[PDB]
Design a protein around this ligand. Structure first.
Ligand SMILES: [Mg+2]
Ligand SMILES: [Zn+2]
Lengths: 106, 1115, 50, 99, 142, 148, 49
DNA sequence: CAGCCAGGGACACGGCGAATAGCCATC
RNA sequence: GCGAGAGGGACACG
DNA sequence: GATGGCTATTCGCCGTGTCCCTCTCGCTGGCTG
């Protein structure tokens, strides 16, 4: 109580716990500043690289939190295709081959 | 009286000045010479001080010694003292010291006196006290070969400062003080939100003041007696909650010394020693004067008892509470009544100037304090009656302090000389930052402003425009430094409405105490103003109008506010502060050209700023020239003595420019003392010449001169109008290596023999040999290392006894993008008995010069902030040409003028055309009304007649219109430029004329030291950082351009994932990927896929090193 | 700085209290302080201010 | 041979500070005498670049993906409107507007 | 997971490392405060640069130089104990110091809020006094 | 209740995870590889301060002194003071200047602990991972190319 | 400053009017530098959020 | 004395979050 | 082939 | 008189733009022949 969790996760957990006993968690909307809303991302690497490295890094260590490596700044540190633009799997995996007509015309 | 007359070989630079100057400009390099002479005690200082305060003649070192001595043991059985600071003649002259990497110093000898008390005897010697660095004739110390300038610092003078802070949470003003000493303990007498008063000693969690009042020994009844008026003080007295002086003493002891057992004698000694023993609390003479003045305690008493006294403290308290009440003026017992006011910590009365002498004195005092510590400690160990001061004094700490000041300090700045103006302006600079002063991050946004007290003491225009605005400034032309440190300014005192010529120097305090009129006021040739109302500066910086009855002081002349650099901007009063600032900053960046033509339009400041810059060689005593040559000028004096001034030809300045001096006299000339015998880099027959006058047109020409771009004519390349000699210096040292020694020889490991063609028999290249990128300058080899022979080769060599003879070639090669003639090879060897760093056998310098022409992109800028790179250099044929057929040498865009409010470039253009073509006012019917105030011998002027417009009193708009009306024809009957200053220009390409007239004239533009050849860079492969395998950085090495966070954000915004991966993975850190990419491109194959950056692995290892188990989960 | 404090969701340095219920208002013009009360239409409470 | 290779090979030009997306743009290079990167005037407003002493950095994409990105996503002719409010940034300004 | 750290990453976890992991990572144990020999400028044995702990400074060369060639890779000298391999292994192979007595990590103690204090319900001042040998503590009273 | 909520924030973090809090107290201290803390040699025989090897030297010296003190047999006061000094040395190694006066270096220069290599605008995250130098790049002054 | 300056840059300012103008000029420059730093920080925060 | 060892405190601000300090209430 | 210090250039006035 | 328990005050901690060029300097002490 008093902690801040993503609304999607909150609704998902409420709908998950409604069964096996009806006691959905009660929540309220909040308006939080940008500095806070970027130091609590679910990726300790982005938060560590952003600001307050000691605090976020050490509390991530205590929580034994795991980064999923699917953000935009997390995939740039490790040197992988950013999940945006030409990097998303919709285009990274597009297969191209000559058409049959032109292939025969070769 | 036109022209600057009090200089013998003055070119007749007619001037537009309307106001005579009562006071000639001072010795612009006096601010440093006087200070260092004070430190030395030189005779000039002695006799001048006798003229202005003979009561207390004491040099800097004398004062340091007197403060320091005596040095006695705690037991009091002996003492040591110093006296007689003597300076020997300098070991080697200025140029020799500059060349041979030697610090230009002189030995210091100080006589000791080791007095004994138990038996009685005094011991005296002459003690070597280090090689004290010695100031040169201009103001530059030659330290370890280089030339350094100790910039004067701005500091807040120690004393008492009262300030009020508005309580937003309560809307109640709180008044506080900050008694700030030198080398002492801070302490505050403040007021909290409530009706109390707090004391902090060394800033210790506040405390009611009363514990202090009783601690000093003041009873409750007597405290009430002293404060018998303030309700707040009786309220505090009710709230003291402390009875007993010793109780307060021990409470304060516990507060300041927690855990230390309090006791009466200890507290009595401590609280006194904190503030009343001069050993650890000494606000200097300036501080004592400030305290006395602010409290008005002692008037006729001389400067004695620099430390505090209880009377001063209680005076501070009572003044504080009276100010809190709202009193205007206050009277202290045993002291003159003084006003009650808050003190501002930026007003130049409370902001003093630590010049060079005081800084070196402070460093010497620190070193001597360390030395005194050492000597007093070793006194105990050494037995008495068996040691000598020569054996007691250890001079290593003092010389160390001197060395670490002059070298690697924040004020012993590297000399900024590429033209005489820059060298002159680096001196006289006031840097507000350094030890004991605020830094950039600590610097706020109020200390950087222009306080009204800067008038006449610190130029408001000239200042750096980077992250140093306001902090770094320069002294005004007429400003002189007070003996205490404040910055004085001369003023013409007006008496009975008569503006006398009795110059008197005032600091900020006297300035704002009295009332000062403006410089350009119409006196009726006798000291009486025309109009009643004149513009006057009041006490608190206000400007108002006052009748000519209350005016008490007058500025000596206009341009009293500007510095030397800004005084050289013609029509300054038409430019804006931003562009005037830019022009003043850029006048210090021009490279010295080869010809250095004087400006057609300038100021009277060029000549003085040139002869005082120092490089212009000047005859000290008159005489008749005997011999003249490129290398020497030998003058014969009036009586017997002859002097051969040695010219300085092709000497590299600190920033790579040339330092040529050329004679401007012949064998038959007679030269008066103080005459300009020879020129310097940027001086033309005595006066400053930073650039060239080119024909300028102010139209937008085909967009090549678009948005500050400038287009020159190929004439400037053909005729070498704008070309500069740049000398670069390269260095290599052969040193004793682990395997042996390093040798420089023509014999070198495998290389084609043609490169050896230029090298001489002993390595270094030959004089006058052109070199390019990759050429050998010093054939050098070093032992390759431990090497393995083939086993058969090894056994054969053991039979031979042959040496390995391996070596590995590593020779001095010029950096990429360098070429030019070789000037000089300077060789230093241990065999020649020179001073070299330990472990170095050989050290050779090679100078390489290049005549850099003007090319595309080179930065050009006038004097009024019209900077711009060179977009295109058109041929001479396709350039706009007047009806006469003279092409315009440069074309400036017209859209850059109106929106910058720097309309002095246009007026400079007009007056430049008027000067080039001359003029003749038609004095057939008297004179024209607009010429009524024009000085005589300006109604006519022959072609190429140099003129001068002083800064804030110069050619008016009406005079410019009149002079353009009469612009006598060049050769035929034709006025190229009509009365509007514009001209009919013929297009160079289309042939037909431009449908409307164009503004043409002559503008003095310069060649800034931002040449392209020094800027261009390209990398494809180079050295790498060993810590993280990213490419190195900078142009000195190969280096690659940084791709920062913002650039990656832009790439992510585009959506270019692969390019970002390329820039961050295999171009920078993929140590296994870079080689593969090189091979793939060379072979033409497809690019390999990037791997994982090495820097991320470094991050991983470091996180692991912090006891953070970072593991990678493949799934 | 207004943008900075708005995007940071700071408590504005110049807060201007807004009501939480409609209805008529009993004004209490305060000197050196202030006081406003809005008669609630739920009537729950005229949230007091100072 | 240099010209031969340099033809049809984009290079990215950048000017710090890279305030917005258009700070970095891909241009088709060509050899020019001198030592200054001749920049098209109309892109100045995109770079916030004036010619009173600025400097710009040039990067070279290598892989076919990088070259395609420079040619398609980032080519200057493909970036006329600002990404902020859609107003044009490659339009004539200053001398061109006066003319 | 991965040891070659190829780009087939999926997750990056960070957690409290215990002494067991510390002694697991290290390829040796530094015990002497020695870095480089004065004269031969060679990594000191048992020091902060010793080859046995971190690897060879020269590619395929042990401290005694008994092997110098690529033919000997992946084996250990039986005299000097250095593992002959590429010098790049000096960038990854870590060490460890066997402290005589336990010590406390600053991040979890002093970083406000003191996580160690919260775990043990101790205010930071008393925690500092306890750790910095200013006064005793009762661990378990029988 | 509020202090309880924070203490829960911590203890629950330890409960849910399979790692014990004992990692807070360190029996052994890892040593970063030498190539990431290189000792470059400046001309004249003076090695430039790598700024980490000296902290490691301090920790090693204090650990050795504590070992020899316990071997020799010393009173509680001296050995406990030694343990405190070892604590401070490891303290400076992990995070310089966080508690007490920073471990000063030559010329009144505080040393750079492992944390300073992360925290700040000059750390690995901000300076060497998000934005890094690149090859195949150049720079030059720009001029107007109206014919392009 | 309630004086105020009354001379156009064409007509040419006087000494004191120029001195008064320097106040605003230098204030603008220093403000510009500090505001650049602040806006850079704000841009970083927005990009990261 | 040098190779080779080694071992005493200054002008910044603004905002956020935790630990107290001081004051009214109740057993 | 690192660190500190100094200087310097480029950065919207509707 | 002490724990609760509410408002205020200190006091630490965190942050405070990007890119580039040039230059100069880089800690102090003991044994012993
Ligand atoms: Mg620009
Ligand atoms: Zn071996």
């Amino acid at each position: 109580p008093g902690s801040l969790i993503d609304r999607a996760e909150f609704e998902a957990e409420n709908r998950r716990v409604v069964a096996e006993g009806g006691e959905p968690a009660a929540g309220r909307p909040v308006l939080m500043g940008i500095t806070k809303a970027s130091l609590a991302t679910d990726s300790w690497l982005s938060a560590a690289s952003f600001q307050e490295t000691t605090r976020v890094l050490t509390d991530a260590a205590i929580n034994c939190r795991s980064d999923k490596l699917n953000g935009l700044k997390e995939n740039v540190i490790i040197g992988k295709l950013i999940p945006a633009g030409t990097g998303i799997n919709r285009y990274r995996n597009i297969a191209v081959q000559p058409t049959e007509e032109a292939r025969a015309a070769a | 009286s036109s022209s600057n007359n009090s200089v013998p070989g003055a070119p007749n630079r007619v001037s537009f000045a309307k106001l005579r100057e009562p006071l000639e400009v001072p010795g612009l390099l006096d601010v440093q010479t006087d200070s260092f002479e004070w430190l030395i005690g030189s005779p000039r200082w002695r006799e001048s001080a006798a003229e202005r305060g003979d009561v207390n003649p004491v040099g800097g070192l004398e004062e340091v010694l007197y403060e320091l001595s005596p040095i006695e043991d705690f037991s009091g059985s002996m003492s040591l003292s110093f006296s007689d600071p003597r300076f020997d003649d300098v070991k080697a002259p200025v140029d020799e010291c500059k060349d041979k990497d030697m610090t230009y110093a002189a030995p210091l000898f100080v006589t000791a006196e080791f007095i004994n008390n138990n038996t009685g005897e005094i011991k005296s010697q002459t003690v070597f006290m280090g090689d004290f660095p010695m100031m040169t004739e201009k103001g530059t110390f030659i330290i370890n070969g280089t030339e350094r300038v100790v910039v004067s610092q701005l500091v807040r003078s120690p004393g008492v400062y009262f300030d009020e802070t508005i309580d937003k949470s309560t809307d109640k003003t709180l008044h506080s003080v900050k008694v700030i000493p030198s080398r002492g303990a801070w302490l505050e007498f403040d007021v909290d939100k409530r009706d109390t008063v707090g004391v902090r000693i060394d800033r210790k969690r506040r405390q009611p003041v009363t514990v202090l009042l009783k601690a000093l020994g003041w009873t409750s009844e007597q405290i009430v007696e002293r404060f018998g008026f303030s309700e707040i003080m009786r309220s505090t007295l009710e709230k003291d909650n402390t009875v007993g002086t010793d109780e307060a003493l021990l409470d304060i002891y516990r507060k300041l010394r927690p855990g230390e057992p309090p006791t009466k004698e200890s507290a009595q000694t401590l609280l006194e020693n904190l503030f009343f023993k001069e050993k650890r609390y000494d606000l200097a003479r300036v501080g004592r004067y400030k305290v006395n003045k602010k409290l008005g305690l002692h008037v006729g008493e001389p400067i004695t008892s620099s430390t505090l006294t209880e009377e001063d403290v209680v005076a501070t308290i009572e003044y504080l509470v009276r100010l809190h009440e709202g009193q205007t003026t206050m009277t202290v017992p045993g002291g003159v009544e003084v006003p009650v006011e808050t003190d501002d910590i930026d007003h130049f009365g409370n902001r003093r100037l630590r010049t060079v002498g005081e800084l070196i004195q402070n460093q010497i005092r620190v070193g001597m304090s360390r030395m005194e510590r050492v000597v007093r400690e070793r006194m105990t160990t050494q037995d008495v009656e068996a040691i000598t001061p020569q054996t007691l004094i250890n001079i290593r700490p003092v010389v160390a302090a001197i060395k670490e000041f002059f070298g690697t300090s924040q004020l012993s700045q590297f000399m900024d000389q590429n033209n005489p103006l820059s060298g002159l302006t680096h001196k006289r600079r006031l840097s507000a930052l350094g030890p004991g002063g605020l830094s950039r991050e600590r610097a706020g946004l109020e200390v950087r402003d222009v306080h009204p007290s800067h008038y006449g003491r610190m130029c408001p225009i000239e200042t750096p425009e980077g992250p140093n605005i306001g902090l770094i400034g320069s002294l005004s032309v007429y400003a002189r430094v007070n003996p205490f440190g404040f910055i004085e300014t001369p003023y013409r005192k007006v008496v009975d409405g008569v503006v006398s010529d009795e110059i008197v120097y005032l600091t900020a305090d006297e300035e704002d105490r009295h009332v000062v009129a403006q410089a350009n006021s119409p006196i009726d040739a006798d000291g009486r103003f025309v109009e009643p109302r004149v513009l006057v500066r009041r006490k608190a910086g206000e400007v108002e109008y006052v009748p000519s009855s209350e005016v008490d002081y007058m500025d000596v002349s206009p341009r009293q506010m500007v510095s030397v650099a800004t005084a050289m901007i013609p029509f300054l009063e038409h430019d804006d502060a931003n562009r005037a600032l830019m022009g003043a900053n850029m006048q210090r960046q021009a490279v010295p050209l080869v010809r250095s033509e004087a400006p057609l339009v300038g100021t009277g400041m060029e000549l003085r700023a040139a002869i005082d810059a120092g490089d212009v060689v000047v005859a000290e005593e008159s005489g008749v020239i005997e011999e003249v040559s490129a290398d020497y000028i030998t003058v014969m004096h009036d009586n017997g003595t002859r002097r051969t001034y040695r010219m300085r030809k092709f000497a590299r300045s600190n920033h790579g420019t040339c330092a040529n001096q050329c004679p401007i006299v012949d064998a038959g000339d007679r030269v008066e003392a103080g005459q300009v015998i020879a020129d310097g880099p940027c001086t033309d027959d005595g006066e400053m010449a930073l650039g060239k006058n080119l024909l300028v047109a102010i139209m937008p020409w085909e967009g090549h001169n678009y948005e500050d771009a400038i287009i020159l004519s190929n004439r400037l390349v053909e005729e070498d109008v704008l070309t500069s000699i740049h000398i670069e210096e390269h260095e290599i040292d052969a040193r004793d290596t682990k395997l042996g020694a390093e040798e420089i020889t023509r014999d070198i490991p495998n290389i084609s023999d043609e490169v050896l063609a230029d090298l001489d028999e002993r390595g270094i290249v030959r004089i006058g040999a052109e070199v390019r990128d990759g050429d050998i300058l010093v054939g050098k080899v070093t032992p390759k290392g431990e090497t393995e022979l083939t086993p058969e080769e090894r056994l054969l060599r053991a039979i031979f006894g042959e040496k390995a003879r391996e070596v590995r070639d590593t020779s001095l090669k010029v950096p990429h993008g360098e070429s030019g003639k070789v000037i000089g090879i300077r060789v230093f060897s241990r065999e020649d008995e020179d001073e070299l760093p330990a472990g170095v056998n050989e050290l050779v310098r090679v100078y390489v010069a290049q005549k850099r022409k003007i090319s595309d992109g080179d930065k050009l800028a006038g004097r009024h902030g019209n900077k711009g790179v060179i977009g295109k250099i058109l041929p001479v044929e396709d350039m706009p040409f007047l009806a006469d057929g003279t092409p315009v040498d440069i074309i400036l865009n017209t859209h850059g003028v109106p929106r910058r409010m720097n309309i002095g470039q246009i007026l400079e253009t007009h007056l430049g055309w008027c000067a080039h073509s001359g003029w003749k006012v038609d004095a057939a019917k008297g004179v024209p009304d607009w010429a009524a105030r024009l000085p005589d011998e300006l109604l006519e002027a022959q072609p190429n007649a140099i003129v001068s417009t002083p800064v804030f009193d110069g050619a008016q708009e009406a005079e410019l219109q009149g002079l353009l009306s009469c612009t006598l024809p060049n050769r035929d009957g034709d006025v190229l430029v009509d009365a509007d200053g514009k001209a009919m220009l013929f297009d160079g390409r289309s042939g037909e004329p431009f449908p409307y007239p164009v503004t043409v004239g002559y503008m003095y533009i310069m060649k800034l030291h931002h040449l392209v050849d020094d800027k261009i860079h390209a990398r494809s492969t180079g050295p790498y950082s060993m810590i993280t395998q990213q490419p190195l950085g900078g142009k000195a090495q190969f280096g690659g351009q940084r791709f920062g966070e913002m650039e990656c954000w832009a790439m992510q915004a585009y959506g270019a994932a692969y390019t970002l991966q390329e820039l961050l993975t295999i171009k920078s850190d993929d140590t296994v990927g870079r080689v593969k990419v090189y091979e793939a491109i060379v072979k033409g194959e497809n690019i390999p896929e990037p791997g994982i950056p090495e820097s991320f692995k470094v991050l991983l290892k470091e996180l692991q090193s912090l006891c953070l188990n970072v593991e990678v989960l493949s799934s | 700085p207004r943008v900075q404090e708005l995007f940071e969701a700071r408590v504005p340095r110049g807060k201007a209290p807004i009501a939480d219920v409609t209805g008529r208002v009993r004004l209490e013009d305060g000197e050196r302080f202030y006081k406003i009360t809005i008669v609630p239409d739920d009537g729950g409470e005229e949230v007091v201010y100072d | 041979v240099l010209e031969e290779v340099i033809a049809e090979h984009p290079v990215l030009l950048n000017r710090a500070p890279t305030l917005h997306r258009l700070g970095i743009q891909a241009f088709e290079p060509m050899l020019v005498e001198g030592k200054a990167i001749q920049l098209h005037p109309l892109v100045c407003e995109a770079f916030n670049a004036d010619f009173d002493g600025d400097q710009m950095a040039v990067h070279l994409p290598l892989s076919a993906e990088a070259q395609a990105e420079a040619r398609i996503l980032m080519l200057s002719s493909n970036n006329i409107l600002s990404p902020a409010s859609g107003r044009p940034l490659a339009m004539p300004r200053l001398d061109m507007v006066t003319g | 997971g991965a040891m070659l750290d190829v780009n087939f990453f999926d997750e990056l976890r960070i957690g409290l490392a215990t002494a067991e992991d510390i002694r697991q990572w290290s390829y040796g144990e530094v015990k002497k405060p020695e870095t480089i020999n004065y004269r031969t400028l060679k990594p000191e044995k048992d020091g902060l640069f010793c080859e046995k702990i971190f690897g060879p400074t020269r590619d395929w060369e042990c401290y005694c130089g008994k092997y110098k060639r690529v033919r000997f890779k992946g084996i250990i000298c039986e005299r000097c104990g250095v593992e002959v391999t590429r010098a790049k292994v000096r960038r990854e192979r870590m060490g460890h110091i066997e402290l005589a007595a336990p010590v406390t990590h600053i991040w979890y103690f002093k970083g406000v809020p003191s996580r160690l204090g919260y775990l043990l319900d101790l205010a930071p001042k008393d925690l500092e006094k306890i750790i910095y040998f200013a006064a005793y503590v009762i661990t378990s009273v029988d | 209740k509020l202090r309880a909520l924070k203490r829960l924030k911590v203890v629950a973090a330890f409960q849910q995870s399979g790692n014990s809090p004992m990692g807070m107290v360190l029996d052994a201290v890892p040593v970063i590889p030498p190539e990431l803390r290189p000792m470059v040699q400046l001309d004249g025989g003076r090695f430039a301060t790598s700024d980490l090897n000296d902290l490691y030297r301090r920790v090693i010296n204090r650990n050795n002194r504590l070992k020899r003190l316990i071997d020799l047999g010393a009173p509680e006061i001296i050995v406990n003071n030694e343990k405190r000094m070892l604590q401070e040395s490891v303290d400076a190694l992990f995070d310089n200047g966080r508690r007490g006066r920073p471990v000063t270096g030559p010329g009144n220069r505080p040393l750079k602990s492992l944390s300073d290599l992360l925290k700040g605008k000059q750390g690995r995250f901000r300076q060497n991972l998000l934005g890094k130098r690149v090859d195949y790049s150049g720079r030059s002054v720009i001029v107007v190319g109206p014919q392009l | 400053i309630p004086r105020p300056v009354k001379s156009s840059f064409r007509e040419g300012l006087t000494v004191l009017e120029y001195f008064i103008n320097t106040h605003g000029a230098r204030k603008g420059l220093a403000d510009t530098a500090l505001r650049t730093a602040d806006s850079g920080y704000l841009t970083r925060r927005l990009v990261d959020v």
